[PDB]
Amino acid sequence: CSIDKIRFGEQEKIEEYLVGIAEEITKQFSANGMNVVFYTQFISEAKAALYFAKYVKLSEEGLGKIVKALLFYFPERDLDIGKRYVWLERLTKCNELPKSIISIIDDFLVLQAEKHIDQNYSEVSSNGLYSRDYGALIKHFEKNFISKRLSEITLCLTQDKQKQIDFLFKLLPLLSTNAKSHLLSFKSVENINDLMNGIRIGLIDEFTPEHEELIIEYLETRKVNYIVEKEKGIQTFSSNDYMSTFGIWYFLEEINNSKMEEFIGMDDQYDFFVDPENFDYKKFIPSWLKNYNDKLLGKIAGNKHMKHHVIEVLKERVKNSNDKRYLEILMNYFI
Amino acid sequence: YDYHFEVNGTVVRHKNKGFGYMERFFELKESCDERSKLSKKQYERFNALFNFFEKNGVICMAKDAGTLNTSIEINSLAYHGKYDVMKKFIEEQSVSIEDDYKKAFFLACLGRWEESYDLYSNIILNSIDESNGCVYYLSQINRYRIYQSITQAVTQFNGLGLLTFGRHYKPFTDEFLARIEREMTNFNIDDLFNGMPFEFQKKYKILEFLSDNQFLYDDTVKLFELTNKVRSEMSEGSYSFGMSSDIVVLLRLYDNLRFLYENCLWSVSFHEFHQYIRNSMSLLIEKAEYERTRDIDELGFSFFGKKSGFFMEYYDFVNISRHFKIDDIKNLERSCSIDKIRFGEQEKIEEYLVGIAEEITKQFSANGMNVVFYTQFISEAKAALYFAKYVKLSEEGLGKIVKALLFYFPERDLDIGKRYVWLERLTKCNELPKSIISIIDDFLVLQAEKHIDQNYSEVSSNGLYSRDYGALIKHFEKNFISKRLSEITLCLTQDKQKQIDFLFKLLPLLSTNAKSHLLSFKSVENINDLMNGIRIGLIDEFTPEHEELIIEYLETRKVNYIVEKEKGIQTFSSNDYMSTFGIWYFLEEINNSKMEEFIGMDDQYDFFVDPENFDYKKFIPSWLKNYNDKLLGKIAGNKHMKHHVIEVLKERVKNSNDKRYLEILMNYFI
Amino acid sequence: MKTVIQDTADVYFKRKSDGKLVFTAEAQTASFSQAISEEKLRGGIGNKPLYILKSEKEINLTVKNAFFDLEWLAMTQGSERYEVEYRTIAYNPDTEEVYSDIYIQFPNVSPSGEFEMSLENGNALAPEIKFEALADTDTDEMAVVIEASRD
Amino acid sequence: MKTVIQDTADVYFKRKSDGKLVFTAEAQTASFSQAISEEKLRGGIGNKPLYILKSEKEINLTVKNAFFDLEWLAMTQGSERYEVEYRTIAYNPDTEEVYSDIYIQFPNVSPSGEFEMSLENGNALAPEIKFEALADTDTDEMAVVIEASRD
């Protein structure tokens, strides 16, 4: 149970201590000194002082100092950007997110693009963030940008920087028009991961038969992987599993192919979305409603096949739990 | 502290910097050939070790141990609730010092303390004759906590007793109090471990912890630690079949359960153990039902694809009887959940139920009564009666409970309404055989034989009376027209009118001749008689005389309400019949138009009879809980103003902190 | 001088049928509990029932007192409708001045004491008293209030 | 005998691109967590997306019974993110025999636990550790489960 606001405010001391706890990172190993005793403290109270975005309302300078800071002056046993980005979003409920802050996260993501080189450590992104998310992050509160520093960066490079060209490829919206034109050449054309990256950054707008062929190729690769896993009795859970994405795309006219129905019986969400008529609704895990958009919940409540048992399982869950999100979605959309 | 003894029965090294003497002993335990390489010199001590060593159940270390299992059993007859056999043992003569200690324990178990203190006095006198070390200090602690209990009860009767029992009951001679106070002016327990011979502690270091106030500090700390440990372990992991949650909890639970409960130490009735049992039991039920309903995507149920389900045993039930006030559902049903498990086997728990019921009947059926005993029995019996409802078993148990509750329970601690509440909740998980119906009929006959008093008013905190018993009888068996009630109605003449109210309340359970006699003996002049006649269902329509009477009542209400408003004394009218009149008007039961001139007396009346000119800023949310009647659904079937209804519903369920406001419409429309 | 704020309350008792004076000086806890609930009390027969008004209405009182009265306590050493009359005051946040007095009266209260304050250590007395609200069959009773905020 | 639930579960690790074997084994805690959380990070878009399936994920993993090892510890005394494999045995309720095993493994894990307990009363070692299971940008990661009992 958590209401987000309360009697929140009190700029003076929370703001000074916010910047004051922002300060120690400046004097760091990346600047000077790696004494472990400092990191025995490290964050014992402060990574959640980053979560203290939802808590009280801050000031413009608070927005400024919550951000061009950590970007440097930090050690590297990672404590990741999943944290960074989720709290970056969590400050959005607190205050505005343009001129006070966006005028610096633009340069922050530009310097992020500056990072990648040909082949050193690939990319991790810890929890599965993807860095590239910045393209849609700007779209979250504002529109495309015309940033020029990474535009010059991509206008100077030409070849051999595969990781650098692909990683910066996902910051296309903030590029310059000349930068976009230059990056459109010598770019990874139709790699599956690169195809999701391109369609996420807004470069692509509509599906193509080549994209359909890539989708069916990925589907048959997944089917043979599942076949050999069943031969070996192995089950895999991956953060890069797009089977649910394919199922919901088939559910909402995104894919018109009829050959895709042959893969029913591999994933629970796949059966749930691809074949609403013949789906065994017992296998529907009710925790998937959290990762569904408002429009997806609205459209899922307009169809008959997901209405008989979904409301019943929701009622069972909300009688059997004190969570508020399921209650909110059931009265706001399901009712 | 050389070894850290895990409560699971396995031991680990803590400060041992030398040889592995416990490792050597455990490797000798599993090897019979090495056990054969010893003489009788060590066998005399192996024999001694065996008994208590396996009495506790230590097995091995934590490294090679496989699947472990502990033994749970209670030989505490005092815990078995059979006081007659302990009285029989009390009447037995003396044998030896240990036996004297046990007998002192049972004398304390009865509640009276005078001869108990005398006994510990003599035992301190002659303890050094046998020169027994540990029992001397155990007896020190004995006499200390006995005196603590006596003085605490005295402070309880000290004041409180006069108001409660009406008379200053003095169960102890003033000489006894004078002697004990003169011999215990200064004694504090801190030095009780400081003034004893220095040879004591070198052999009894462990046992000192029972003297000071640390009797609970070492225990509850881990309890309140693991509580949040599992509560935040929650339902996303930290998952295994037999290492998740209360694993060590049962270990320490039944390890320290019988510690005082088998050595026969005394404060077995102390709020510390109320506390310990209530917490422990809550952790058990919580882990069980957090396993039960947890969401499982793929790996939630791959771990522990079996459940312990908290199959409570007789010991737990006795704990609930003894040291439980919420008793666990009393608050942990408004808060916690329930779904079936098996309330399992019974060996003699029905015999324990009769061991409670027959002792209660013998006590309250005997003029002699010990106030200390009544005070040490009433609450535990209340808990046992309150939580014997959900049990289902051979009605061996049922009729004795009903008879004892109807005929022997004190009337100072309970009224008729709560009595009916006890008998109604009795049948929640139980049917109504003929024996219980006969017993309650006999209770009603006794009540009729009582209703001659000229000043008795049958005061109750629930508003329910003996009429509810006949109503319940009709609810389970409509065709049970009474026999003796007709006789007492026929034997009553017009000279006496004090039984008119009782006859009107219990008129449905009457013979046809009794019905005719009551019809010839009917009287309707005031407002209460009309309400009672409506309650039984006899009244179907309303004559103009009733409308005139209700208009006169409303006029009187108005002419006193204006006077109260002039002075400024806001009104309550706890028995709010104005809301009843609003209900009358709303349901088209009365279609008159003369009540619209009294709009504004109460907010509920304005909400009911004035939907067009009502402001929803004074909406009290308790108006949805008055009942579960279909009437709530009928009045909630609104279309015109349902926007405000859903607004207040979403405002209330935004917190979602009241289960009623959601389960009211859970599946009502479905 | 920061926010250690707090108020006070008055607790008055009385024994019916005579003018006995019993009262409590202060009530620190003063835990007031009001419960309304129901589970099932309707058979559902007779076609039209025409009536239902059941509502479990209980009022709970709790005080802590160190002042009984010897004037009678000593005489009794060598019952009645303890009826209770709570007394308190209210303040206006706009002015924060002493202008209003609030009375709460119960004409039928029967004390329901629990005989189990079994505790090891000697407390600062503090004999917490808990009460139950009792009602007759005639009418009214329960709670009565008087307003004293006239201006 | 009467009422206690009992099994065993071990804790095993390894190092990526190495044969180094140094860690605690058989932690009675062996605790784990899983969570999927979402927030208002997509409240606004060009009004023509397909899906991204963001699904902020969180995985804790804590094990504690000490005695890691001494050989590789000594070798390292003078950032591959390691590798972890887990083993759990599931028993059949109907038969209750050792027939089925559960295999769990995570490619990347980051041990990030607080480094200041400092309890007043000296415990039996008890260096509790916690782990966060990391994921790369290529593919797979998270949990690869192999099901035994091919009978």
Distance from CA of D140 to the nearest CA of B (A): 17
CA distance A155 to chain D (A): 25
Report the residue from D44, D108, D140 with minimal CB separation from A140. Answer: D44
User: Which tokens is B632 given?
Assistant: 């709530």
| Per-position DSSP letters for A63-105, written without gaps between them | HHHTTSSTTSS--SS---HHHHHHHHHHTTTTS--STTTHHHH
Chain C positions in Cβ-Cβ contact with residue B475 (cut-off 8 Å): 43
A134-141 and A81-90 helices, crossing angle to 10°? 10
**Does B269 touch chain D if contact means CB atoms closer than 8 Å?**
no
Could you say which residues from 440 to 479 on chain B have a Cβ atom under 8 Å away from some Cβ of chain A?
none
Is the Cα dihedral B356, B357, B358, B362 positive or negative? positive
Closest CA of chain A from D53, distance in Å: 7
Joined together, the tokens standing for residue A161 give 């920087």
Helices (H), chain D: 71-77
**Given an 8 Å threshold on Cβ–Cβ distance, is A319 in contact with B666?**
yes
Q: What gap in Å lies between CA B365 and CA B640, rounded to an integer?
A: 63
Q: Which of B458, B535, B573 sits opposite C51 (nearest CB)?
A: B535
The amino acid occupying position A85 is Y
Q: Token pair 């998980």 is at which residue? A: B429
CA distance A290 to A328: 11
What is the rounded end-to-end Cα distance, in angstroms, of chain D? 31
Distances in Å between the Cα of B261 and the Cα atoms of B77, B269, B274, B349 are 10, 11, 14, 19
Q: From C67, C26, C57, C59, select the one nearest C145 (Cα to Cα).
A: C59
CA separation for the pair C3, B380 (Å, rounded): 44
Distance CA D72, CA D19 (A): 10
Q: Please list the residues that pair with C105 across neighbouring strands.
A: C85, C144
Are D71 and D100 in contact, with CB atoms under 8 Å apart?
A: no
Q: Are A132 and A197 a contacting pair, CB within 8 Å?
A: yes
Alpha helix locations (H) across chain A? Answer: 11-23, 36-41, 47-51, 60-65, 81-90, 102-113, 134-141, 149-156, 162-169, 177-184, 192-200, 209-232, 243-251, 268-274, 294-300, 310-319, 325-332
* Length of chain D (residues): 151
Helix, strand, coil percentages (3-state) for chain B, rounded to 5, are: 55, 0, 40
DSSP string over B626-668:
S--SHHHHHHH--SSSHHHHHHHHHHHHHHT--SHHHHTSSSS
Are C73 and C142 a contacting pair, CB within 8 Å?
Answer: no
Q: Does D138 touch chain A (CB under 8 A)?
A: yes
d(CA D124, CA B367): 61
Q: B237: buried, middle or exposed (CB in 10 Å: 19+, 13-18, 0-12)?
A: buried
Instruction: Give the Cα separation of B189 and B197 in Å (integer).
Output: 16
CB environment B575-586: b (16+ within 10 A), e (fewer): bbbbbebbbbbb
Neighbours of chain D (3+ CB pairs under 8 A): A, B
Backbone angles phi, psi at B12, to 5 degrees: -135, 155
Which residue type sits at B182?
Answer: R
Alpha helices, DSSP H, located in B524-616: 527-535, 544-567, 577-586, 603-609
Does an interface of 3+ CB pairs under 8 Å exist between D and A?
yes
What is the radius of gyration, based on Cα positions, of chain A? 23
Chain D contact probe: residue of A50, A169, A239, A254 with most D CBs at under 10 A: A239
Q: What is the DSSP letter of B491?
A: T
Buried b (16+ CB within 10 A) or exposed e, B241-266: bbbbbbbbbbbbbbbbbbebbeebbb
**Nearest 5°: CA angle at C6, between C1 and C8?**
135
**Cα distance between residue B654 and residue A3, in whole Å:** 9
Q: Do C145 and B475 touch (CB under 8 A)?
A: no
Give the span between the Cα atoms of B255 and B251, in whole angstroms: 6
Distance from CA of C43 to the nearest CA of B (A): 6
Q: How far apart are CA A124 and CA D140, in angstroms?
A: 12
Please, which chains are in contact with A (at least 3 CB pairs closer than 8 A)? B, D
What's the token pair of residue B277? Answer: 């049992």
Q: Which residue has the tokens 């003699």?
A: B348
For CA atoms B591, B596, B602, B606, give the dihedral sign: positive
Find, among B469, B468, B467, B465, the residue nearest to B457 by Cα: B465
Choose among A235, A287, A324: nearest Cβ to B656: A324
The backbone torsions φ and ψ at residue B597, rounded to the nearest 5 degrees and listed phi first, read -80, -10
Query: D1–B311: do the CB atoms touch at under 8 Å?
Result: no
Interface test with D, best of A122, A141, A291, A294 (most D CBs within 10 A): A291
* Helix (DSSP H) and strand (DSSP E) numbers for chain D: 1, 10
CB of D108 within 8 A of CB of A124? yes
Q: Which residues contact B568 (CB under 8 A, 6 or more apart)?
A: C147, C149, C150
- Tell me which of A47, A79, A86 to substitute to probe the interface with D (most D C-beta atoms closer than 10 Å): A86
Tell me the C-alpha distance between B508 and B504, whole Å.
8
The amino acid at residue D7 is D
Cβ atoms within 10 Å, residue A273 = 22
User: Strands C33-35 and C58-64: what pairing?
Assistant: antiparallel
Place of tokens 């209703």: B451
Q: Which residue has the tokens 């009551």?
A: B518
Q: Where are the alpha helices (DSSP H) in B13-165?
A: 21-29, 32-35, 40-56, 77-80, 83-91, 97-110, 114-130, 133-157, 161-165
Helix (H) or strand (E) holding C86: strand C83-91
Residues in C 33-92 with any Cβ partner in B closer than 8 A: 36-40, 42-43, 46, 48-58, 68, 73, 76-77, 79, 82
For residue B653, count other CB atoms closer than 10 A to its CB: 17
User: DSSP code of A304?
Assistant: S
| Strand arrangement, sheet containing C20-24 | C20-24, C10-15, C83-91, C98-106, C144-147
Q: Please state, in angstroms and rounded to a whole number, the distance separating the CA atoms of residues B111 and B338.
A: 37
Nearest to D6 among B242, B254, B298 (CB): B242
Beta-sheet strand order (sheet of C128-133): C33-35, C58-64, C128-133, C109-111
Per the listing, tokens 């306590």 go with C73
B461 close to C (CB below 8 A): yes
For residue D100, list chain A residues with Cβ-Cβ distance below 8 A.
Answer: none
Contact partners for chain B, using 3 or more CB pairs closer than 8 A, are A, C, D
C50 contacts B413? CB cut-off 8 A: no
CA end-to-end distance (rounded Å), chain C: 31
Place of tokens 């189990």: C116
In whole angstroms, give the CA distance from residue D112 to residue D114.
7
CA distance linking residue B430 with residue B393, whole number of Å: 9
CA atoms within 13 A on the CB side of A20: 6
Give the C-alpha separation, A169 to A113, whole Å. Answer: 9
Residue partners of B189: CB distance under 8 A and separation at least 6: B144, B211, B212
- The answer to whether B662 and B650 have CB atoms below 8 angstroms apart is no
CA B379 to the chain's CA centroid = 8
d(CA B605, CA B614): 10
Residues in chain A after which the backbone breaks (C–N beyond 2.5 Å): none
What token pair was written down for C3?
């926010």
Inter-chain touch B662–A319, beta carbons under 8 Å: yes
A148 contact B CB<8A = no
Contacts of residue B481, Cβ cutoff 8 Å, sequence gap at least 6 = B509, B510, B511
Nearest CA to B425 among B387, B473, B463, B474?
A: B387
Q: Indicate the SS3 state at residue D130.
A: strand
The answer for residues whose C-beta is within 8 angstroms of residue B232's C-beta and 6 or more apart is none
B154 and chain C: CB distance < 8 Å anywhere?
A: no
Residues of D with Cβ-Cβ distance to B64 under 8 angstroms: none
Contact state of D140 with A236 under an 8 Å Cβ cutoff: yes
For an interface test with C, which of B163, B214, B528, B560 has the most C Cβ atoms less than 10 Å from its Cβ? B163
Question: What is the experimental resolution, given in Å to one decimal place?
Answer: 4.4
Instruction: Tell me the one-letter amino acid at D129.
Output: I
Residue B650 and residue A285: Cβ atoms within 8 Å? no
**Which residue is it, tokens 């599942």?**
A226
d(CA A69, CA B190): 59
C-alpha to C-alpha distance for A188 and A180, rounded to whole angstroms: 14
What's the CA gap between B223 and A184, in Å, rounded?
64
Kindly tell me whether chain C and chain D come into contact, counting contact as 3+ Cβ pairs under 8 Å.
Answer: no
C-beta of residue B257 within 8 angstroms of C-beta of residue B302:
no
Contact D114/B at CB under 8 A:
no
Instruction: Answer whether A113's CB lies under 8 Å from A161's CB.
Output: no
How is residue C71 written in tokens? 């004037």
List the single residue in D with minimal CA-CA distance to A205: D48
| D91 Cα to chain A: minimum distance (Å) | 18
Phi, psi angle pair for A138, to nearest 5° = -65, -35
Residues of B in contact with C139 (CB under 8 A): 528, 575
* Closest B-chain CA to D30: B238
- Quote the CA–CA distance of B357 and D116 in Å, as a whole number: 58
Element (DSSP H or E) covering residue C14: strand C10-15
Which of D11, D10, D130, D14 is CA-nearest to residue D82? Answer: D14
State which approach was used to obtain the coordinates. Answer: cryo-EM
Does A237 contact D142 at a Cβ distance shorter than 8 Å?
yes
| Selected residue of B56, B71, B234, B236 to mutate for chain D interface (largest D Cβ count, 10 A) | B236
